[PDB]
Amino acid sequence: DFHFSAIFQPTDPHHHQTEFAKVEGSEKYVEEVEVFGRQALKVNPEALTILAHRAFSDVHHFFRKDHLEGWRRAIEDPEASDNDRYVATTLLKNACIAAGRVLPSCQDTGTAIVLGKRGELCWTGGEDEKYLSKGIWNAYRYHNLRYSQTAALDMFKECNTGDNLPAQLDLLAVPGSDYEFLFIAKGGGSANKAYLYQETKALLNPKSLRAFIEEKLKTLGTAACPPYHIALVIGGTSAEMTMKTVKLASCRYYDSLPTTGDKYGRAFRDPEWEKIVMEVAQKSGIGAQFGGKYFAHQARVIRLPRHGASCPVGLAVSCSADRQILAHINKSGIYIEQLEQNPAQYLPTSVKVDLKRPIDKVRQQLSQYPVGTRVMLNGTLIVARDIAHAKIKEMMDNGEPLPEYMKTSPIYYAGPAKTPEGYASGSFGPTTAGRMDSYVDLFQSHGGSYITLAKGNRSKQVTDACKKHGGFYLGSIGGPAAILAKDSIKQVTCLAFPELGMEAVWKIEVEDFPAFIVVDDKGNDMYSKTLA
Amino acid sequence: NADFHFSAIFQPTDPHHHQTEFAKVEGSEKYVEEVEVFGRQALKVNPEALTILAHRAFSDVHHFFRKDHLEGWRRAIEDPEASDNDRYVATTLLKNACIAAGRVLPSCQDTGTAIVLGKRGELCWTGGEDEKYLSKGIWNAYRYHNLRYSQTAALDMFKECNTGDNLPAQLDLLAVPGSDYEFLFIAKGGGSANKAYLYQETKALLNPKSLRAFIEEKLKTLGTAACPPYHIALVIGGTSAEMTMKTVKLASCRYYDSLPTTGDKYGRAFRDPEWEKIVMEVAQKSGIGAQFGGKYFAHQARVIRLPRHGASCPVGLAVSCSADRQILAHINKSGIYIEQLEQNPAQYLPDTSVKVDLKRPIDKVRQQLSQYPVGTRVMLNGTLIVARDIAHAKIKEMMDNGEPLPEYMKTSPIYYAGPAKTPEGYASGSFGPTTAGRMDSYVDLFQSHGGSYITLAKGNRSKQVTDACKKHGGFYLGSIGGPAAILAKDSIKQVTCLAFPELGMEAVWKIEVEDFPAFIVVDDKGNDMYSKTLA
Numbered sequence A: 001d002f003h004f005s006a007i008f009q010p011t012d013p014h015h016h017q018t019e020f021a022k023v024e025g026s027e028k029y030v031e032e033v034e035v036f037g038r039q040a041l042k043v044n045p046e047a048l049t050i051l052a053h054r055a056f057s058d059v060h061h062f063f064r065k066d067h068l069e070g071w072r073r074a075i076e077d078p079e080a081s082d083n084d085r086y087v088a089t090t091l092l093k094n095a096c097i098a099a100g101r102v103l104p105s106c107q108d109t110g111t112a113i114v115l116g117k118r119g120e121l122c123w124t125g126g127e128d129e130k131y132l133s134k135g136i137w138n139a140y141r142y143h144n145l146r147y148s149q150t151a152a153l154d155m156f157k158e159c160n161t162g163d164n165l166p167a168q169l170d171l172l173a174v175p176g177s178d179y180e181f182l183f184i185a186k187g188g189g190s191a192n193k194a195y196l197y198q199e200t201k202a203l204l205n206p207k208s209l210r211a212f213i214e215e216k217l218k219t220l221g222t223a224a225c226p227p228y229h230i231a232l233v234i235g236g237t238s239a240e241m242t243m244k245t246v247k248l249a250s251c252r253y254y255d256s257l258p259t260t261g262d263k264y265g266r267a268f269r270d271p272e273w274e275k276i277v278m279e280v281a282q283k284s285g286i287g288a289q290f291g292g293k294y295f296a297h298q299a300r301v302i303r304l305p306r307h308g309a310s311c312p313v314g315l316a317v318s319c320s321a322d323r324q325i326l327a328h329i330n331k332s333g334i335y336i337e338q339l340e341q342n343p344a345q346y347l348p349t350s351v352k353v354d355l356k357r358p359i360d361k362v363r364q365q366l367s368q369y370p371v372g373t374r375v376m377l378n379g380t381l382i383v384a385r386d387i388a389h390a391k392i393k394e395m396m397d398n399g400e401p402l403p404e405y406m407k408t409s410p411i412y413y414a415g416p417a418k419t420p421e422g423y424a425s426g427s428f429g430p431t432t433a434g435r436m437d438s439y440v441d442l443f444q445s446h447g448g449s450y451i452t453l454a455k456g457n458r459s460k461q462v463t464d465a466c467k468k469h470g471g472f473y474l475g476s477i478g479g480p481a482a483i484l485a486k487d488s489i490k491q492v493t494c495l496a497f498p499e500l501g502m503e504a505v506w507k508i509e510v511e512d513f514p515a516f517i518v519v520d521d522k523g524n525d526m527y528s529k530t531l532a
Numbered sequence B: 001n002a003d004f005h006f007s008a009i010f011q012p013t014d015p016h017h018h019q020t021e022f023a024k025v026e027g028s029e030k031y032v033e034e035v036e037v038f039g040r041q042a043l044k045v046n047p048e049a050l051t052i053l054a055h056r057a058f059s060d061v062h063h064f065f066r067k068d069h070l071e072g073w074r075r076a077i078e079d080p081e082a083s084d085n086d087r088y089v090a091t092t093l094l095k096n097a098c099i100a101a102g103r104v105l106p107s108c109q110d111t112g113t114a115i116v117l118g119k120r121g122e123l124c125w126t127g128g129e130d131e132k133y134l135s136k137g138i139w140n141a142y143r144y145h146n147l148r149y150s151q152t153a154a155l156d157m158f159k160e161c162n163t164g165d166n167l168p169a170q171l172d173l174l175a176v177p178g179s180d181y182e183f184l185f186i187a188k189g190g191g192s193a194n195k196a197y198l199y200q201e202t203k204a205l206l207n208p209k210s211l212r213a214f215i216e217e218k219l220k221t222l223g224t225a226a227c228p229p230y231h232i233a234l235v236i237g238g239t240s241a242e243m244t245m246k247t248v249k250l251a252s253c254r255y256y257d258s259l260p261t262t263g264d265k266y267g268r269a270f271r272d273p274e275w276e277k278i279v280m281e282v283a284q285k286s287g288i289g290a291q292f293g294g295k296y297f298a299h300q301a302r303v304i305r306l307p308r309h310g311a312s313c314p315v316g317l318a319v320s321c322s323a324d325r326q327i328l329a330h331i332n333k334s335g336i337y338i339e340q341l342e343q344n345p346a347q348y349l350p351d352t353s354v355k356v357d358l359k360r361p362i363d364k365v366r367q368q369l370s371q372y373p374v375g376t377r378v379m380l381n382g383t384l385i386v387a388r389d390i391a392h393a394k395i396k397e398m399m400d401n402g403e404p405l406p407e408y409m410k411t412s413p414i415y416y417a418g419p420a421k422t423p424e425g426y427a428s429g430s431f432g433p434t435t436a437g438r439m440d441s442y443v444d445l446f447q448s449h450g451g452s453y454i455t456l457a458k459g460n461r462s463k464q465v466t467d468a469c470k471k472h473g474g475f476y477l478g479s480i481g482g483p484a485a486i487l488a489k490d491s492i493k494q495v496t497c498l499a500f501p502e503l504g505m506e507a508v509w510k511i512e513v514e515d516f517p518a519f520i521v522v523d524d525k526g527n528d529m530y531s532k533t534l535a
């Protein structure tokens, strides 16, 4: 009467559909043995250091075919908007710079996430987390990446860990004698777009579910650098199980799941509703960041079993920095997923803005154009993001003035990766503007931050502030951190708060920096029609 | 390459939970054998041990509680600052635990989703079929005890059926050092699981003024729908949304109680007792109380601060409910050990109502209820029609296809509930209320067709229900949430399946009750018992 049925039953559990390359001479780190009648694998734990180092190096310079195919699709589709094509060409060009293995594809080299599946008869000595972390530590310390992890000394006092540790190390116990891995370099921006909804049976009908999807996709906006790999999970045995599934779905880790359910509650991919998600994404008009058709590369929809009283729902994306890498260790050595090393094969109206003027002259010029105008910035930018804004607001709350460097130049929300030797700058693309939304009106009423430069749609309070104070929000393309570093950024200098690491205040000299006018000084928002 | 220093995110001082009392399963040392391979100590474990362990865990956990849960109910009774309703609810739950301690009726009708957190040592060898053997033990517990099958299978996106055995379970088996097998078993109720919330916040939250205002705002959204007093867990930060939500779940089980209380430059997690005190103050000063106004919104609080990506600040909020059900266990060279729960809950008990006859026309019951303000405690005697999520959806679907609202929705108040299995020789199994909010979208519709004028469930409801009851002369009665066993033993005299038997526990039932306690939460006049504390 009892029948065991696993929730997840992929037809390709070992990811044979993926191409792997064996690390040279890595068979010296493994040995096949037979203990108590069973085949087992002795693994030198140094193999985990080697594997994690190479994984978190390669993943910042190369992409999977399905990601690159999406960018070419946006360029070649006659139905794509001009802005769709412009963004996809920029991102593909950026991937070509990153393939040089010097500049990472994004300044946000992400949180290191390891999903490991150690077989019952795979023996490493048991110090897997330490040895994996050292390999991650090696990748971020000795390559031109970024230290993005923020340690809490108490509830509110924070510091950068200086090495991109700690990693998220999810090590699972599974049958057999191999060691299987999924490594993810997960950007903070795309991580912030992982959403959990507590729903009910009233959602579970075609009309309600479609309306739900139309409503929730808009809340993703453009803040996580679309085109998106959109993942949606309906159901789950718990919120954390739902959120883990939607993360893995976004990495296309569950692509070989069955496509039908059964009376035992197994998970399944729903291709009909993936098609509906894609239809909503295209008809939304949100586009590849600035209006059009290519809001999404592709969609994954996974239906999960549920408690009768529960319906958790997960929504997540993978961003332009689509960075995951499969790997395994077996009796033959260390195998790591082979990424596309020649992205160039996938490649088939502007207003010059002189910033080397008083900020009021720059504001006047910007006032002459409507939202949606593409501009090219030439001059000095002051760079500040989350913590700097918080420190500055605190200074003003204690009677101190708004710093002079918040009034001379447009404010670029960004945090750079490390500078390669002999380079003007490391990868240096924008960060999400919405996170600074609560400082705009305050700073503008005190005579600064009249012009901001970042990526993503912003809230109505920012539109109101720019109209009230004669301000502007310029949207940079999100994602192309390397080509911006290589072509646009000529000089980088730390201005204030050097203890903050990448979150210090910087002053940079730029040339031909592309941006769109998203919010003008008149109440207009380039996203007001597609993200209403 | 020596600047490197590994720091585990979680560094409990009591990783093996030595502070917890364990009992050895008698003769269970016959399932393990110590061996030596390549100079290293390893433990051979017969997988039958995982069936035995999971079966025992998911049986005991439905009849007994931990001391810190029971002490909270006693605190609510003995605190001079506790409201009268606080004391009434806590006494009811304690009396309910005494019935559950009889090992026949489970403490709650929602015997939950079976969740296993397992940590298998590298040299702990089970044969590798841990999931199957664990699931068989879970299957044994729910099949052979008076529990409930609560799991819903999706045949397609929208076609659903009950799995009939409370499987699948959630099985999270981790690879860890050593040769032992350590476990946390959780029987997680659906209602409290629904009150696990994820917020995507920013650095602008990370100051005392913003964080306190955030906690005040978010705690109210928990409401009374997950049967408080709550164990409230709050996690600030995390390396990912799923890691944040996993942590807040574990915090609510007090699994992270021995974490350090200070951070360091390496980003380790820590418990923050100062902000735990702040959560308790917000909870107590909220006036929400133990379901019906007062001080005891929360038993206790856990606040864990996590590291974060500079651009990120995920926040998790979750509760453990009155059916606070978790059990620790481990397997080692000595056998199977399982956490010892409190078997005499009665030692925690220390040493004005309107009678409503339901055996009348529903319009006369509405008239009587109209005489009283919200907050009036009533005592129900008569027939209830029982229907929840799927039945309500099926009935609305029928009306959308031109069929009338069924007559059995108009004759009697509607009790939102789904019973556990009936013990032999009992009138009914555990049979407490379901969260009312989930049916909010049907009330106005059903009332416009002459039914669902009186509903009986637990939890605060949305404004549309208040409007509907005012427009249609309706009432919402809040039962005490949680005391499913004492309701079954003392109040429910007859249970009969009326319609949709294929839905299992979600069928439409007709039950006869006596002395069923409830509060008037929404009257027919626009008044809501929760309008001041949950505004």
Ligand code: SF4
Pocket: A106, A107, A108, A110, A186, A187, A188, A189, A190, A223, A224, A225, A319, A320, A321, A429, A430, A431, A478, A479
């Ligand atoms: S591509 Fe955009 S969303 Fe992704 S890591 Fe880079 S900046 Fe954050």
Ligand code: SF4
Pocket: B108, B109, B110, B188, B189, B190, B191, B192, B225, B226, B227, B321, B322, B323, B432, B433, B434, B481, B482
């Ligand atoms: S006590 Fe309340 S919230 Fe907890 S499982 Fe029972 S009905 Fe659900």
